[PDB]
């Protein structure tokens, strides 16, 4: 009973542009799951990007992408989006979506990758 995450919408955009990412999660109880986005620069470590909760649309963003990126969810289509505005070359990384339960995320553990058991393969985002 492992959920499958398939990302889409990755490409090469110029500086200051915008690009939207999507990630479809396989299975039911998508409305009960906590979704998040992560990125990984070439030769770096998985770093937090954004995260949406299971109710009331509670969101959390990394300081480097606050005000620039926007995360949203759709429980009817079992997908989550990451609208990336005001792109700079520092955002060139492989972006991956992750799925977890609210019992995992806790209160202050929403940015730790070890608390998301299911991960996606990751799509490339490149900023000139």
């Amino acid at each position: 009973a492992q959920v499958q995450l398939v990302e889409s919408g990755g490409g090469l955009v110029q500086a200051g542009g915008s690009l939207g990412l999507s990630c479809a999660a396989s299975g039911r109880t998508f409305s009960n799951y906590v979704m998040a986005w992560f990125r990984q620069a070439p030769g770096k470590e998985r770093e937090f990007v954004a995260r949406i909760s299971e109710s009331r649309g509670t969101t959390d963003y990394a300081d480097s992408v606050k005000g620039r990126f926007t995360i949203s969810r759709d429980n009817a289509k079992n997908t989550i989006y990451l609208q990336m505005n005001s792109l700079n070359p520092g955002d060139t990384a492989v972006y991956s979506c992750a799925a977890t339960l609210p019992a995992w995320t806790g209160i202050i553990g929403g940015r730790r990758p070890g608390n998301y058991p299911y991960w996606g393969q990751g799509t490339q985002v490149t900023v000139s």
Partner: peptide
Amino acid sequence: SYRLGGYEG
């Protein structure tokens, strides 16, 4: 620790 950090907690 579990109610604060979750799984890693």
